[PDB]
Each structure stands twice: as C-alpha cells, then as structure tokens.
C-alpha cells in the first residue's frame, strides 16, 4: 500500500512511512540480556529485550549493538531487531508494503546479501530496495550538487554529487564516528576519578557527551581559557544522585574528529578528508562543491562544528573561493527523510526489485544499477 | 494435599498450612531438661520439655536453644522440636504433604543436608524445599524491587532484588541480633544491681526487652534527656512480685544495632551494611532500592526504628533519592506469610524435590 | 648521592637504594589503631602501629590500607608510612637523595600532584620522578618488545612496547587483583563453616591463599576430579591452634582471573584482555607481542598461571604464531628492580624534576614528557 522508509544505523533505528515528514519509530538499536543469573523459564522471566524497553531495565542487563561499523555482526538480534519494529513499533505486516533500507558505501557484499535474503525470506516483503544514505541526504536538503558528510554512530563518509551524476571514485569512508567518540570520553573521565566500566555506564556517558560537548574554535585558545579559568566547567547528575563536574574535556571528546591521533589513528580529520576529496573531482566542478556543503548525521550535532568546519576549508582553499557549510536544524533526520521523498517518486517505482527478479536472478540482482 | 510451611527461626517456630493468612503453631525453640536431680524414671517424670511446656516449668529446668546463630547445632534436639510441631502443635503426618523449611543466606551445606536427610529419612515427607527468607519476605510485601533487610533471633542479612531477579554477590550477613542484644541487656542491667545469671532468668530479660525497650531519633541528646530527667524511668514486676526499675537502659540495649562496638565487634551498623549493599549495586538500580527498604522479623519491632533507619539512610545518601522505609505492622511473620504465597503458587509446583529425586541424586540436588 | 627506589604498590611498600639487586625494605602497607577502648596517653600507649608492627598486635587493632584501587584515599596514613619508610626503615633523611615512585596508568591527575606536594613540602626531597609500573617490569626483564600483564593487590593492567616505543592507545585497566581474591575467599570459606569477618582474619585468609590456592590446567576437569576424590584436600594450621581443611577452593578463588563474573564483573579474563589489547596493535607488531609476554607483581605468583596463559592466548591466536609467556622466579620484585635499572642510566639524568622546575612551573609539571 505504502512504502516503508527504515533508516537502521548504527545504534538506532528510524522507521515510518513514506510521504510523512518525520517517522515514527526512533529507538536504540540494542539488545540486552539478564547479567546476573539465569533466566527462570518458570516464570514470566523475559531472556532478552529491544530497544527502549532495554534502555529501562539496563541495570540489570548486557546490551549489544548488532551493527558495528555500519556491518551487521549478530544476525539474530538483527532480525529480532527489524522483528520488534514491524510488529511491536510500527503495528504493520512486513508482507503488506515494500521496504526502503539505508547503507554506507564501500561496505562488503555480502552484508547486503544477507538482509535482502531476511527481507525476503522470514519477512515475505513484496520488494525491497537498498540505498546510499548520502544520496538520500542530498536529496532531502533539495539540491542537486554538493558534497555530503555523513556521521553516525559507526561511519563517516563523504560523497560528492554534480548535477545529478555521481562521482563514486571521489567517495571516502573513516571508521571514526561516535561510539569511538564515546569510548575516548569513558578513557577521558578517569582523569578525574569517575569510572564507567560496564555498558549501562556507556549510555550514561554518550548523554553525557550529546548533553554537554561541543567543538571550540581554536583548540589552543580553549585549552589555554579552561586551564586559567573556571567558567568552561559544567555539571551532571547521575541517576543515583551523584554529581559530577566536566572541565576540558567537554571540547577534547569531539576533537578528535578534527584530530584522529588522539585515538592513535593515522587518518587525517573531517576537514582534511573533505578538501582531498574536492581535489579528485574535474577543476571545472570544485569550486560548486565548495559552495555546498551538506551535514547530516547525529555526530554533526555539536555546537559550533559549521563554524570550525568552514573556518578550516577557508583556510584549505584558496581566497576566491565561495565556502559554505550547509547544517539544517534537523540533520540526525535528514537521511530518512530523503528516503520517504526517493520511495514518493513515481519515477523510483522502476527500482523495486520484485520476488520474481530475486528468485530467478539470485542475490547478485541486490547490486543491479537500473536508473 | 496442602503444602506446609515451617519457619524455623531461632529460637521461634512458626508452623502452618499454605494458603492460611497466618500459622496456627507458634513456640519457642527450646528444649528444657531437669537441673537439681537426676528423673525418677520409676514414676510418671518426664526427662525433657519442648515449646511452652518448658516455658511454664522452666524454675527447675535448664534450656538450650538448638538452632545458634542460624546454624543447627543439636541434632536430637532439633528432630524433637520437629516431631512435637508435627503430632503434637499441628496434628498432621509429615509423611502426608510437602514441607517449605526457610534458611538464612551464606550458611554451611552441610546443615541444609542433614536437614534434607532427616526430612527424608525419620519422616517420609513427599517432597521438600528451602529457600531463603528475605525472598519470601519481598514475596509477602507485594513488590518485585528492595533490598531487605531481615533480622532475627541469631542472623541478620542483608538481599536486594530487582525486577525479580536476584543479586547474590551484594548479599549481607551480620551475626549480631536479638539473643545479642538480650546477653547485653543482661550484662548493663547489673549497674542497678539487678542479677539474672540462668536460663529462665535470660528468658525473664527477654520479655523485659521485647516490652519495655525502644530505638531513640538522637542518642546523645536522649542520654543527655535521661540524665537530667526522671521522665525516661519505667518499672516493670518480676515474676516473684518484686519491681525494677529501667532507665536509660531502654534505649542502649538496641542502639548496638547501629553500634555494634558496644559489644567488642569490628563491624559497622545496620544503616552502614544497607548502604554499602546498595552502593555495590549497579548505578541504574540504586535508586528503586533506596526507594524501596523493607523490614522484616522479631528485631525490627522496636518503636522508632524506621525513623532512625530513613535518617540515617537519609544522611549518607544525596538529597536527590527518595528514601522508604516500609515497615508493615505484620513484620514478624512476614517471612511465613511469603511462604503461604510461595507454596500456593501453580509455577513453584516444580520445585519439590521428590522422593525419587533424592534417591537418585543424592544430597548435592539440595543446591 | 644515591637515589631511592620505592614501590609503593596497594598494601606493600618495597623501598631500597639504586644500584642493588633487591630493597632493603618490604613490608605491609597498613595502619592499625586500637580497637576496644580509647588510648591511655598517661602512660606508654601508642595511638597507631606501621607495617610489620601493626601486624604483630593486630589482634587488638583495626587496621586500614591507605592505597585503595591505585588511588590514595588517606593521605595522613600515607604519610605516616613514608615517614617510617624513611626515618625508620631505610635509615635516611628524604632531604639527602632523590626518590623514583611508581604508579599505575589511567590514574587520576590529583593523586600524583598531592603526591609531588608531599615528597616535596613534607619532605625536603632534591628531586623527584614518577614512572609507570610496567615500562619497569620490561626494563628489569631486559627486552624492549613485550606485552606486560602487570596484577598486584588493587590494580591490573596491560602495557605492550615495541621497539622502545610506547603504544599508550592500547593500554589496558582492570580493577580485578589480590585483594578481590582474598574477599572471594573469605566469602567461599563460608560453605565450610569457616568464618572470618575482621581485618586480622583477612590477613589469615590472605595468608592462606598465598600459601595453598593454585591455577588449574582445566576447571571443569579440576572440579570433577575434586568431587570424585580426596587427593585435593589441604590442611591449615589457625593461630589459635585449630586445624581447617580446604579443597577445590584452592583453584575456584585464582579462577576469578579469567571469569571475572564469579564475583559479579562484567569484565573479561586477563587473557581474553591480552589478546584485545594485541588485537589493537598494527599488523605487523603482533607477532612479536604474541613471542613477548611478561609477567610481573604478586598475583601472578600462583602455580601453573602460566601454562593456563599460554593455553588459553594459543586458543584464542592463530595456530601459526609463536606464543610465549615469560614469568621470571622473581616477578614480585621485577617493578622495583626496572627502577634500580633506570635510576642507575645517566641518560635518565634529564627526568628529575627538580625544586626550581617544581617552585617555578607548579602541580603541572608532574605530567610533563622530558625523554
Ligand atoms: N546533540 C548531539 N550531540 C553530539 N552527538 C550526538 C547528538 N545527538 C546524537 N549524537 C550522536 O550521534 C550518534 C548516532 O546518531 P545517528 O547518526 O542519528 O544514528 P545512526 O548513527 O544510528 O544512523 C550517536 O552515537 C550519538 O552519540
Ligand atoms: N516487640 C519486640 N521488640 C523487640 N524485639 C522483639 C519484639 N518481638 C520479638 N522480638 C525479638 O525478636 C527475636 C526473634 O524473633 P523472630 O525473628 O520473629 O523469630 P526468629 O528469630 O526465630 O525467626 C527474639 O529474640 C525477640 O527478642
Ligand atoms: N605466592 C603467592 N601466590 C598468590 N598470591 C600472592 C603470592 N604472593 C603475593 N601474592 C599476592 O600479591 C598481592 C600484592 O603483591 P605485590 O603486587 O607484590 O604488591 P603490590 O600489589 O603492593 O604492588 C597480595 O594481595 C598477595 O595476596
Ligand atoms: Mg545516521
Ligand atoms: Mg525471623
Ligand atoms: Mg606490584
């Protein structure tokens, strides 16, 4: 009837329908399980919950991410996973609508394989189609050329877009993204004496980290402000009623997205990365991704990210050049809502690919190009 | 046909049916023994007295307690108090219907062994199980999530539970309790002049704790009111008619459960112990258990005890937590009542250690 | 004239001068006060005891360890044990010799800086210098390639260098160590009816693990051999006479090194931690970090640790690789004696923080890198 939009990244999951402006279904991609003894199949002992529901009850559980690094790893939960929000989130059949998933480029083949095979065998989908999420970025912010930086939770990737033809050997992937971000600050709070060992503790500091970071400027002048002065100090409190106060390290945790070395990666930063991927493409298009740069993704969410991003392209390119850094207020969303306008064309309703052509073509048809 | 439920406490049984709202048998766990003279056999004179039959005779007897810091330590003893609950206080064959005996957390697998052997071999019970006493008073309360702190005659123990599920490494046992603090009233009561050396008299000092004594908000400024007033003083009469006289007394024998160096013990106090337990759990429980502290046993009864529970719970924890203490007028019994529900419910059915169990397994099937 | 090794590791301090073979003091890190009533300061009573004299009257005492976890939680203690260390142990003025201390990595930053205040407010020390325990062990063993699993009484943790150079990204902590053990025993002795409950008990059950308790090949093995016969049983001679007899609790208390979820941690075993820690190292670096592994501190004196090390890592690495565990007769002492090494380097000579660097720079010169 409708097409069914599902953004699963890593650690989250954003489903709805097609057509609507924002979905419906947005939750941890987590699994949890009892820690401390065994389940009493006895009683109405759940072995396991999804989502909010473990979010609830993580004192008492071990949670997993299925997707590491934009690569599915436990299938099981995976499918548990996409089972909870088809019949549990969403309130719909999976055998009613076609399915419009996301995924990062330069990912392994058969990761893709493997979920049209569950899309099409424990779910008895109609047709299903695969995407990139940058493209459906783009798409959202409502132009036709730019380049596009895209953070998670596990991926980063830039790819940059002309006219509506894509350049896929300009494309570059980073494995730095926010759980990486996350573990750093968990490495970083020690310095104070506060100890976050378990992964309950992990959620309580990625809050910590979207409640109180943000990106400085100048990281010298920040450093030189926090170490001669109090006011960059914030404080939280903890669900037991603790209290704890943050200094530096409220902008040394997203630094490392402009400096990787501090996590012992050779790469170079976002900046970095997005000029040399400009310096690939023809010379007679540079100077139009310069003048659009498109943000999306949570780990964009930072405050003060636009502003430090543009000041080190200016710096990067030359004088005359037309630099612009594009960050909407809804970027974490943005993806998605490019998939529920690409599933609205009448001019998409070509790419579904049908049980028909999966049956007879096998799972080779998932890397088919139709346009 | 009906399940039985039996909580053995030291120093007290309480016996019943599951199902009831309360247990019929409640005594004692003494078994009291002729002092002055060897029993003239010849004639119609008994050599031991179990529950209140030794209780009203107990001027010329000597009176043990079989059951010492929730260990059993008389074997003999102990299978005679149970024959007395099963043909003489309830009126039932063993042999009939399962039992639900309860045990105290950390105890030595040896006395949960012997105990199966003889609910197995000197009475042909059916089926049988242990289980441990603050899960059945969580069970009683109502609640799935609290920390319990149960305190008795001989243990004191401390057990959280979230969610219904268990969390045995923050499990707590102290050996101070009643029978403790009853030695210690027995020893502060000789600055008056007062002497009780024997058993009965220990029982005597009992009665006058369970009656007169109470846990103050302030222990300093109570003993500062006590000195300079006569307003503290109660009088109490002794068996033979004579009257004494109490006074600060009344509230330093329990203040050992939050001094235990009263006594010569390392350890810190009842509010210290919750506290700890409550801080090994994980950060995202902590909350519902400082919410939810739940009392139970004979020891918990003292007038005040809650209120100088919540403030002192109140001072080590921040002033962002809710703080409960639930303190049911019913504590005493609580353990037997979750018990009644435990053995009542469809899911425990499969609990019971039956007969061929045993026989096939042997001992190590009581873990 | 001579500088001062100490290693002041979590209730034991070993102190002596650079340049020997071993220090002249090893002796427990405690502080015991009177416990029954108060001190009579008319007459000779003393209010505290230190070290081996606390532990000869602790019937009567309570006693305390300064050092909880790695981190100094009593700094008046701290000092009284310095002080004897000094003007009781070793028989020098602080004020003569400079002093080398270790520490634990991923400590708080204030417990050095206090620690500097002391060595040098409290005592006139000339010069100062705190080094990682295990850069110490890999120097006293004399290799420059090497993984370290350094575990003591509060702190364990993983240390890997190649070539010389520091790898600090892929440094490893654990809360797990010996005195985790010696509670783990205390509490299993219970189903024996043994009861232990104060601090001088705790000594005798510490006492009792460093003398009986062993690392098993197998553990299910051991467990079923251990309830099939007798051959397992040790006896234990009380101070006050009596005789306990012990059985398969001699392995269960070291096995918590590698289950961690006996006592409740969601952590991982020593061994499973080891190899993540390689795992992170550059491919062309494990391989000399699988043929390097060095042990050191107290809690890696049980028997057969080492073959269930090797087992294991061969287990988890692959089958063409060279694995190695390396366990000196002389581990306990292996830390101090990197020191009396590098005290004794003339190229070592630039690190002493001296008094004007000190007076001059501040608390923050403690975290600086000379090399
Ligand atoms: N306001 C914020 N500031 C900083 N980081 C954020 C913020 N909101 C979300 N994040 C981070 O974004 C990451 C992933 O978000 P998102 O990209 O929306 O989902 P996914 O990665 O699953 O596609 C999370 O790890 C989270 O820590
Ligand atoms: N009202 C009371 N006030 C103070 N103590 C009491 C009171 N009632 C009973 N006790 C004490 O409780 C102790 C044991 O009671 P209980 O826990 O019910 O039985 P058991 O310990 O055998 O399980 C006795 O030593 C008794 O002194
Ligand atoms: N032979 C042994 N077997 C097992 N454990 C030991 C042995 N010797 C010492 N230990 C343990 O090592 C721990 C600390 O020793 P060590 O690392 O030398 O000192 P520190 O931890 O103070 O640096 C102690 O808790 C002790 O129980
Ligand atoms: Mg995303
Ligand atoms: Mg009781
Ligand atoms: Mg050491």
């Given at each position: 009837?409708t097409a ?6 890593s650690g989250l ?13 947005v ?6 399980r ?6 009493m ?5 759940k ?11 993580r004192g008492?559980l071990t ?9 599915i ?12 929000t ?5 309130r ?20 893709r394989?493997?979920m049209?095979?569950?899309m099409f ?13 940058a493209?459906?970025?783009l798409?959202?912010?409502?132009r ?10 596990g991926?980063?990737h830039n790819v ?9 050997h ?10 990486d ?8 709070l ?9 992964t309950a503790?992990?959620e ?6 979207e409640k109180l ?5 100048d990281?010298?002048?920040?450093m ?8 960059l100090?914030?404080?939280?409190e ?10 530096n390290?409220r ?7 402009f400096?990787?070395?501090?996590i ?10 997005t000029?040399?991927?400009?310096m690939?493409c023809?010379?007679?298009?540079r ?10 993704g949570?780990t ?8 430090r991003m ?12 037309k ?9 974490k969303?943005?993806?998605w809502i490019?998939?529920?306008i ?12 049908t049980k028909?052509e ?7 048809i998932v890397?088919?190009k139709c346009?």
């Amino acid at each position: 009837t409708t097409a069914l939009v599902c953004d699963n990244g890593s650690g989250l999951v954003k489903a709805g329908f097609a057509g609507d402006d924002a979905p419906r279904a947005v939750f941890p991609s987590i699994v949890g399980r009892p820690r401390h003894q065994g389940v009493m199949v006895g009683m109405g002992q759940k072995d396991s919950y999804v989502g909010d529901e473990a979010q609830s009850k993580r004192g008492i559980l071990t949670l997993k991410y299925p997707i590491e690094h934009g690569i599915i790893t436990n299938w099981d939960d995976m499918e548990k996973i996409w089972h909870h929000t088809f019949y549990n989130e969403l309130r719909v059949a999976p055998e009613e609508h076609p399915t419009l998933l996301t995924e990062a480029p330069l990912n392994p083949k058969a990761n893709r394989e493997k979920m049209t095979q569950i899309m099409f065998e424990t779910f008895n989908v109609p047709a299903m189609y695969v995407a990139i999420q940058a493209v459906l970025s783009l798409y959202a912010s409502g132009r036709t050329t730019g380049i596009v930086l895209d953070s998670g939770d596990g991926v980063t990737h830039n790819v940059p877009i002309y006219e509506g033809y894509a350049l896929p050997h300009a494309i570059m992937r980073l494995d730095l993204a926010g759980r990486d971000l996350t573990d750093y600050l968990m490495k970083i709070l020690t310095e104070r004496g506060y100890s976050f060992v378990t992964t309950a503790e992990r959620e309580i500091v990625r809050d910590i980290k979207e409640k109180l970071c943000y990106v400085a400027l100048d990281f010298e002048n920040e450093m030189a402000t926090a170490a001669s002065s109090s006011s960059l100090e914030k404080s939280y409190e903890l669900p037991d009623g603790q209290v704890i106060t943050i200094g530096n390290e409220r902008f040394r945790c997203p630094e490392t997205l402009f400096q990787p070395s501090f996590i012992g990666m050779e790469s170079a930063g976002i900046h970095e990365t997005t000029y040399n991927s400009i310096m690939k493409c023809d010379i007679d298009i540079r100077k139009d991704l310069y003048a659009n740069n498109v943000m999306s993704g949570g780990t964009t969410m930072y405050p003060g990210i636009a502003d430090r991003m543009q000041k080190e392209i200016t710096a990067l390119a030359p004088s005359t050049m037309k630099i612009k850094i594009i960050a909407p207020p809804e970027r974490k969303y943005s993806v998605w809502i490019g998939g529920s306008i690409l599933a609205s064309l009448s001019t998409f309703q070509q790419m579904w690919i049908t049980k028909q052509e999966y049956d007879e073509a096998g799972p080779s048809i998932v890397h088919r190009k139709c346009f």
